[PDB]
Each structure stands twice: as C-alpha cells, then as structure tokens.
C-alpha cells in the first residue's frame, strides 16, 4: 500500500466512524451490515 | 415488540442520534455547527431515531432500521451531488 502509515494513522484518528473514506464497491446489503456494526460500537 | 426497550438507555439513544447526525453530515466546520440549520438536522435525526425506536420489535431490528435509514440518506446525498456533475 502507498499511503505512509503515519499519515494513515493521523487521518483515521481524526475521522468520525460514520464518515465514508472512499467509494469502494460492495453490495447494498454489505454496507448496511457495516453500518449496523458502526452503530453497535461503543 | 416493546420488551427490549427496558434494556435501552436514554444514554444509548443519545449516542445513536449522535451517530445518525454524523452519518448525515460527518464533520461540520465551526460555522456550520453554529448554524440554525444544524439544529434542523439534529431534530430530523432525533425524529428518525424515535421513529425506528417506536417501530422496531427487537434491539437487533432497531439497529437494522437505523442502518437502512442511513444507507438511504447517504445514497440520496450522493445522487444529488452526482446529478450536478
Ligand atoms: Cl466516531
Ligand atoms: Cl437502493
Ligand atoms: Cl470486510
Ligand atoms: Cl413485549
Ligand atoms: Cl438565518
Ligand atoms: Cl422519548
Ligand atoms: Cl437542484
């Protein structure tokens, strides 16, 4: 992977979980299950 | 149908409304956070959450209904933006 891990860590640390980070293909159903997961978290 | 409510705290519902707001509008700048329109957004979120809370039959279905709503709102935002390109 090409994003330096320190930058990756900086971005991920500072991004709300509910915000999308990119638009990689995945079915509607998989995204909804992911969203269910994001809501369940503490 | 409504027994699961006993386990759901107001503290939980509040965290969920918060996640619902972030899902609609992830990282507002200070000006946006201060805008009256941000209140409109928050009220809409609380409205959706309350709707799902009062129509789900289990905690699992409650999360699922919220997720479906989020999917649908985000899809609406993405489409509107693409339509202007
Ligand atoms: Cl978060
Ligand atoms: Cl769809
Ligand atoms: Cl995965
Ligand atoms: Cl019951
Ligand atoms: Cl105004
Ligand atoms: Cl209430
Ligand atoms: Cl328009």
UniProtKB/Swiss-Prot annotation, chain A:
It is found in: Nucleus. A motif (9aaTAD) lies at residues 5-13. This is MLL cleavage product C180. It comes from Homo sapiens (Human). The chain holds residues 2843 to 2869 of 3969 of the full protein.
Curated annotation (Swiss-Prot), chain B:
It comes from Homo sapiens (Human). This is CREB-binding protein. Residues 1-78 form the KIX domain. Methylation of the KIX domain by CARM1 blocks association with CREB. This results in the blockade of CREB signaling, and in activation of apoptotic response. Acetylates histones, giving a specific tag for transcriptional activation. Mediates acetylation of histone H3 at 'Lys-18' and 'Lys-27' (H3K18ac and H3K27ac, respectively). Also acetylates non-histone proteins, like DDX21, FBL, IRF2, MAFG, NCOA3, POLR1E/PAF53 and FOXO1. Binds specifically to phosphorylated CREB and enhances its transcriptional activity toward cAMP-responsive genes. Acts as a coactivator of ALX1. Acts as a circadian transcriptional coactivator which enhances the activity of the circadian transcriptional activators: NPAS2-BMAL1 and CLOCK-BMAL1 heterodimers. The modification Asymmetric dimethylarginine is found at residues 13, 37. The KIX domain mediates binding to HIV-1 Tat. It is found in: Cytoplasm; Nucleus. The modification N6-acetyllysine is found at residue 69. It is linked to Chromosomal aberrations involving CREBBP may be a cause of acute myeloid leukemias. Translocation t(8;16)(p11;p13) with KAT6A; translocation t(11;16)(q23;p13.3) with KMT2A/MLL1; translocation t(10;16)(q22;p13) with KAT6B. KAT6A-CREBBP may induce leukemia by inhibiting RUNX1-mediated transcription. Found in a complex containing NCOA2; NCOA3; IKKA; IKKB and IKBKG. Probably part of a complex with HIF1A and EP300. Interacts with GATA1; the interaction results in acetylation and enhancement of transcriptional activity of GATA1. Interacts with MAF and ZCCHC12. Interacts with DAXX; the interaction is dependent on CBP sumoylation and results in suppression of the transcriptional activity via recruitment of HDAC2 to DAXX. Interacts with phosphorylated CREB1. Interacts with CITED4 (C-terminal region). Interacts (via the TAZ-type 1 domain) with HIF1A. (Microbial infection) Interacts with HTLV-1 Tax, p30II and HBZ. Signal peptide: none annotated. It comes from the Eukaryota.
